[PDB]
Design a protein around this ligand. Structure first.
Ligand SMILES: *[C@@H]1O[C@H](CO)[C@@H](O[C@@H]2O[C@H](CO)[C@@H](O)[C@H](O)[C@H]2NC(C)=O)[C@H](O)[C@H]1NC(C)=O
Ligand SMILES: *[C@@H]1O[C@H](CO)[C@@H](O[C@@H]2O[C@H](CO)[C@@H](O)[C@H](O)[C@H]2NC(C)=O)[C@H](O)[C@H]1NC(C)=O
Ligand SMILES: *[C@@H]1O[C@H](CO)[C@@H](O[C@@H]2O[C@H](CO)[C@@H](O)[C@H](O)[C@H]2NC(C)=O)[C@H](O)[C@H]1NC(C)=O
Ligand SMILES: *[C@@H]1O[C@H](CO)[C@@H](O[C@@H]2O[C@H](CO)[C@@H](O)[C@H](O)[C@H]2NC(C)=O)[C@H](O)[C@H]1NC(C)=O
Ligand SMILES: *[C@@H]1O[C@H](CO)[C@@H](O)[C@H](O)[C@H]1NC(C)=O
Lengths: 317, 160
């Protein structure tokens, strides 16, 4: 008679690696890496994303006339800018510190427009439009021009009593010829200032034709800033000012992402979202994307992370 | 392996041991049979289950990388940001890969140790009443029926 001690063997095909041996057969193992995603842009625990299919972030901020669907205000978990989004700054010109503007905007979770300077305050024309901007103009600013062949010094003030900071925008027009300059502002030498308790910005125009953009030789240099609660914004100009009309009250904190993809969006909710798709999992790691956000596992750039649970699988035969 | 039992002096596993990782096989007049040792198997199950749970809890924290936009004159900042991201990824991937490789070795060796400890427990209990065949079995010097075999399995063998 006899009694023997032994251990289990199974038909498991699982294998794991160690530092002193690779592909060690084991009876039981656990994959710690999640590798699947749904191939869609979904909502996260913070809500649905703001999907911009025709307008860019700056186009929305400055109120490109082709982005009216966005005038009402939105809230989001993250922002998606489709490759089809081409409506930005319709009138030729660049936004100073654009990357910071887009970052600031995307970091918030919502915006609501607020009127800064009512059309009635001006003593000059304010309905200027352009063929480059759908025969209209930005909803965030007014292109002030001469009225009755006169352009008196414009001096307007606005005090922020909303309790929240206000992102505001303005621009400086640079005509292509001296005729357009005088024609629009009555004078060729102007001075414009945008000031608050913290900023003291002044601008001067420079007439001349720039290379053609959207069929125009003229330009508008775009600028922005943030009016803190209690602060007062004051603008003065005797020409060339593209005055602030409406600003934005930014609130909250979103995931702070701007995804640039044409990935399909869906009526879904996920814990973790990436630019390639979203996922749900209790595994500690994933290899979908280092850019993942939301409630996510840790990203690891590997194909598998198999942890041994059982023992070395040794066939008797 | 480190403890010399699994794929060691006990040359192969048993496909007939369905209930657990470690067990006993006996041979007497009444026949041959095997069953898992519940005590040793359950203790091992609890330990590895805790290790898995702790690894998950310690390693599931995400790190955040935002694909920041940079202007044409921020190329240095762009490179510095990329350096940060590349190293965050490389360091964590190394930590994850190594933790798994190293703990895997320990896990396999711990199973080996459990088999070794069970074998030594029986050897000690049997004393001079049995001889080791060198392959994981103990050849008893006296007849041992099923009830006798049970005292060996549950650790109450009388003759230790
Ligand atoms: C447009 O003109 C009106 C009238 O000249 C300006 O309003 C006056 O502003 C002064 C100084 O700010 C005040 O003392 C008066 O009480 C205001 N009177 C009126 C008519 O409201 C107004 O400021 C001008 N707007 C701009 C943009 O310069
Ligand atoms: C992934 O997890 C999310 C939540 O973590 C799941 O979303 C739920 O979807 C149902 C659909 O009827 C809603 O009723 C719940 O309110 C949602 N949860 C919350 C609180 O947002 C989602 O279904 C999961 N997706 C997968 C992979 O099945
Ligand atoms: C993430 O992990 C997967 C799974 O290991 C990687 O491997 C691919 O997985 C799919 C589905 O299992 C297979 O059909 C492919 O043949 C695998 N390709 C290979 C050889 O890697 C996948 O590549 C990983 N993804 C990333 C982003 O690296
Ligand atoms: C180990 O096995 C032995 C034998 O099966 C058990 O001893 C028996 O215990 C029952 C209790 O109901 C008695 O009626 C029998 O007379 C005992 N058999 C003999 C002759 O030894 C013992 O209880 C078991 N011990 C453990 C820890 O389970
Ligand atoms: C295990 O594999 C062997 C050989 O392929 C086969 O004969 C046996 O039936 C299998 N046992 C299981 C897991 O059913």
């Amino acid at each position: 008679d006899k009694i023997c001690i032994g251990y289990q063997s199974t038909n498991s095909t699982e294998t794991v690696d160690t530092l002193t041996e690779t592909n060690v057969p084991v009876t039981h193992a656990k994959e710690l890496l999640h590798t699947s995603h749904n191939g869609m842009l979904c909502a996260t625990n913070l809500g649905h994303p703001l999907i911009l299919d025709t307008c860019t972030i700056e186009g929305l901020i400055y109120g490109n006339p082709s982005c009216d669907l966005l005038l009402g205000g939105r809230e989001w978990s993250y922002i998606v800018e489709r490759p089809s989004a081409v409506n930005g700054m319709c009138y030729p010109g660049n936004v100073e510190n654009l990357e910071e503007l887009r970052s600031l905007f995307s970091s918030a979770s919502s915006y609501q427009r607020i009127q800064i300077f009512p059309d009635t305050i001006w003593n000059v024309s304010y309905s200027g439009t352009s063929s480059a901007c759908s025969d209209s103009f930005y909803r965030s600013m007014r292109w002030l021009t001469q009225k009755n062949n006169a352009y008196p010094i414009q001096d307007a003030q606005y005090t922020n009593n909303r309790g929240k900071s206000i992102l505001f925008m303005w621009g400086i027009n640079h005509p292509p010829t001296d005729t357009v300059q005088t024609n629009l502002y009555t004078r060729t030498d102007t001075t414009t200032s945008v000031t608050t308790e913290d900023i003291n910005r002044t601008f001067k125009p420079v007439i001349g034709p720039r290379p053609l953009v959207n069929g125009l030789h003229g330009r508008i240099d775009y600028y922005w800033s943030v009016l803190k609660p209690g602060q007062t914004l004051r603008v003065r100009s005797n020409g060339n000012l593209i005055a602030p009309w409406y600003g934005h009250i930014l609130s909250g904190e979103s995931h702070g992402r701007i995804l640039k993809t044409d990935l399909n969006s869906g009526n879904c909710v996920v814990q973790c979202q990436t630019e390639r798709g979203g996922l749900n999992t209790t595994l500690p790691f994933h290899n979908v994307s280092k850019y993942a956000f939301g409630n996510c596992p840790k990203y690891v750039g590997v194909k598998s992370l198999k942890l041994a649970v059982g023992l070395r699988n040794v066939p008797a035969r | 392996g480190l403890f010399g039992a699994i794929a060691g002096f006990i040359e192969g596993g048993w496909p007939g041991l369905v209930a657990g990782w470690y067990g006993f096989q006996h041979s007497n007049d009444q026949g041959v049979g095997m069953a898992a040792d519940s005590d040793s198997t359950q203790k091992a199950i609890d330990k590895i289950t805790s290790k898995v749970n702790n690894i998950v809890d310690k390693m599931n924290k995400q790190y955040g990388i935002i694909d920041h936009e940079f202007s044409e004159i921020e190329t240095r900042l762009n490179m510095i940001n990329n350096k940060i991201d590349d190293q965050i990824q490389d360091i964590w991937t190394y930590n994850a890969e190594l933790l798994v490789l190293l703990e895997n070795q320990k896990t396999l060796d711990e199973h080996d140790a459990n088999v070794n400890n069970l074998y030594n427990k029986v050897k000690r209990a049997l004393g001079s009443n049995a001889m080791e065949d060198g392959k994981g079995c103990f050849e008893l010097y006296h007849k041992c029926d099923d009830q006798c075999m049970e005292t060996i399995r549950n650790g109450t063998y009388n003759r230790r």
